[PDB]
Enzyme design. Structure first.
Site, mmCIF file in Angstrom:
data_model
loop_
_atom_site.group_PDB
_atom_site.id
_atom_site.type_symbol
_atom_site.label_atom_id
_atom_site.label_comp_id
_atom_site.label_asym_id
_atom_site.label_seq_id
_atom_site.Cartn_x
_atom_site.Cartn_y
_atom_site.Cartn_z
ATOM 1 C CB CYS A 1 -36.647 31.243 -21.794
ATOM 2 S SG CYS A 1 -35.380 32.195 -20.924
ATOM 3 C CG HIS B 1 -14.773 41.893 -26.395
ATOM 4 N ND1 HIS B 1 -14.644 42.868 -25.431
ATOM 5 C CD2 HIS B 1 -14.291 42.432 -27.539
ATOM 6 C CE1 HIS B 1 -14.122 43.954 -25.971
ATOM 7 N NE2 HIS B 1 -13.895 43.714 -27.250
HETATM 8 O O1 LIG Z 1 -35.959 32.312 -17.353
HETATM 9 C C1 LIG Z 1 -36.970 31.644 -17.531
HETATM 10 C C2 LIG Z 1 -37.947 32.067 -18.605
HETATM 11 O O2 LIG Z 1 -38.180 33.478 -18.531
HETATM 12 C C3 LIG Z 1 -39.262 31.278 -18.596
HETATM 13 O O3 LIG Z 1 -39.834 31.399 -19.907
HETATM 14 C C4 LIG Z 1 -40.292 31.759 -17.567
HETATM 15 O O4 LIG Z 1 -39.792 31.569 -16.241
HETATM 16 C C5 LIG Z 1 -41.604 30.996 -17.694
HETATM 17 O O5 LIG Z 1 -42.589 31.557 -16.824
HETATM 18 P P1 LIG Z 1 -44.064 30.896 -16.756
HETATM 19 O O6 LIG Z 1 -44.561 30.993 -18.183
HETATM 20 O O7 LIG Z 1 -43.820 29.471 -16.309
HETATM 21 O O8 LIG Z 1 -44.820 31.756 -15.764
HETATM 22 O O1 LIG Z 2 -17.521 40.356 -21.404
HETATM 23 C C1 LIG Z 2 -16.456 40.894 -21.127
HETATM 24 C C2 LIG Z 2 -16.429 42.377 -20.822
HETATM 25 O O2 LIG Z 2 -17.257 43.101 -21.739
HETATM 26 C C3 LIG Z 2 -15.010 42.953 -20.751
HETATM 27 O O3 LIG Z 2 -15.070 44.086 -19.872
HETATM 28 C C4 LIG Z 2 -14.413 43.399 -22.093
HETATM 29 O O4 LIG Z 2 -14.162 42.270 -22.939
HETATM 30 C C5 LIG Z 2 -13.093 44.143 -21.894
HETATM 31 O O5 LIG Z 2 -12.557 44.533 -23.163
HETATM 32 P P1 LIG Z 2 -11.155 45.323 -23.253
HETATM 33 O O6 LIG Z 2 -11.290 46.484 -22.290
HETATM 34 O O7 LIG Z 2 -10.133 44.297 -22.814
HETATM 35 O O8 LIG Z 2 -11.067 45.718 -24.710
#
Ligand SMILES: O=C[C@H](O)[C@H](O)[C@H](O)COP(=O)(O)O
Ligand SMILES: O=C[C@H](O)[C@H](O)[C@H](O)COP(=O)(O)O
Ligand SMILES: O=C[C@H](O)[C@H](O)[C@H](O)COP(=O)(O)O
Ligand SMILES: O=C[C@H](O)[C@H](O)[C@H](O)COP(=O)(O)O
Lengths: 152, 151, 151, 152
Positions: C68, C101
């Protein structure tokens, strides 16, 4: 036939100077870090450390430089002031890779306040490992940069 | 009047009208001077970096905006011109701090790396954000000048 | 064959053919299944997040790609479907780690925030990078499942 | 009339938990940090802390949540599993602002290993200070997310 990598920081990036040394080594056994940054977190001026690393690269004492400041911006400006230096401010894997492939960059700049350390790690490893493409158009453009230096 | 010279290479040509618009969006005082290519044909970024950078160095314009695929080539080439402080920015924070700390006069962006709405934010933030004028920053900027002078 | 359902809303429609191409670029075994809008006219992202998320949840396709403006809407809406682990990625590192991860099955990207060559890198990295299978990650993924179950 | 902001992390982000508390305060005196993350750097499972913050937001005990892990990805996924939560993984000012303007996000997720702390600061301040637009298309889309929750 190993490859020397000079490392410099200013004060905020001093916090990660050991990280930077480690990440260079992690790029491969052929990469030898040469630390040239400060020894404390006391306020210093980034151009002084950019200059130290940049001059080493320009004189070909080392092949590569790694510079870190708060944002990387100061290091990238200051380092590029030295003729022969191509300093690339990188914020991700793609910029790190392309700085080498396209720009044959010899210094990578990063920001300690902007980019998390594991991305900095990836940037350094990618920068060091990725070869220059050697393609005609890039060589021509790099030569044009040199021409700009020559004119000044 | 605060004149802003704009340069691109070929990948960023498709967004050159965007760049002109974003400069204007920063305020009525900001006047875009487009200095980039006239067609989508492949060109060499240092030629356009040089044009813009020389204009900034000469004080012909206050600011420059440079875009290439990654922004990297533009930042390297532009910084080769004495008096130029070209900042490769990838977000609002880098755009703001390039001004506050570095008193940057050229912003570089990557068309292939940074989405256009972030490029918009970068340009507007760069143009609108003042330099702090702080002692330490002024000292460091002068040290950059000294590096130029030494070479 | 590893099928990859693709969904966008309107700002990302412009790059829907890019997304199809990037999936194929990850390897001959990756088969894009385009489920997004057929036109550029305004749509609601949750409708397309839902379509792709349900396909992943059902085990109809192994992976989803959602784009998006910012990727944020896609990531929120897709994660509302039990069995979905949708990762908003903005670089190579987040793309890789989402797999290593989080064993993520949907990658979300922002067309307005992230340049297309970085989006390319994200998609290729997401699809090529395997889950680590490490004990701690498996346990944490199971706890996410338990959050779903408790609701 | 103050605005409560619950904060959770896992282990890599525990190092910046005091930062997160401070950044919430920096958003304005009307924002009150409610720290709910680990008390130590001990390894923890991110979904447990995502759940605690997300439940607080969903039950309306707090208005906002801030979640930090290594990448922010795990926090984003886990928090969004709680009905009524709209958790936005943000990496910059733009995503932080738009998560509010467009998505009326109530939880901001960040990566300690990916995003430098001064950008995290900017993200949190921007997230908390930026109002939801209230515009028709966004309200409809947010309602459609609610419908997805309801269907499960
Ligand atoms: O998270 C939503 C995304 O960024 C959409 O594309 C965005 O909100 C659309 O914005 P608009 O084109 O309706 O102004
Ligand atoms: O999305 C999860 C986050 O990045 C965690 O902090 C990450 O997986 C931790 O990793 P580790 O320290 O257990 O290796
Ligand atoms: O580009 C310059 C770099 O970001 C410096 O680290 C920064 O300006 C130093 O800031 P301060 O610590 O002197 O405030
Ligand atoms: O830094 C240089 C910029 O990324 C250029 O736009 C890029 O090298 C052009 O690449 P190509 O179109 O010649 O492949």
């Amino acid at each position: 036939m190993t490859r020397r990598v000079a490392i410099g920081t200013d004060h905020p990036a001093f916090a990660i100077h050991e990280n930077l040394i480690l990440y260079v080594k992690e790029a491969g056994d052929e990469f030898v870090p040469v630390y040239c940054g400060p020894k404390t977190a006391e306020s210093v001026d980034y151009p002084d450390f950019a200059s130290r690393v940049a001059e080493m690269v320009a004189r070909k004492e080392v092949e590569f430089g790694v510079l870190a400041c708060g944002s990387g911006i100061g290091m990238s400006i200051a380092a590029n002031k030295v003729p022969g230096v191509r300093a690339a401010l990188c914020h991700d894997h793609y910029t790190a890779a392309m700085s080498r492939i396209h720009n044959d960059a010899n210094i990578v700049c990063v920001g300690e306040r902007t980019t998390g350390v594991e991305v900095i790690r990836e940037i350094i490893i990618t920068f060091l490992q990725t070869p220059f493409s050697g393609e005609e158009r890039h060589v021509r453009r790099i030569e044009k940069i040199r021409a700009i230096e020559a004119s000044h």
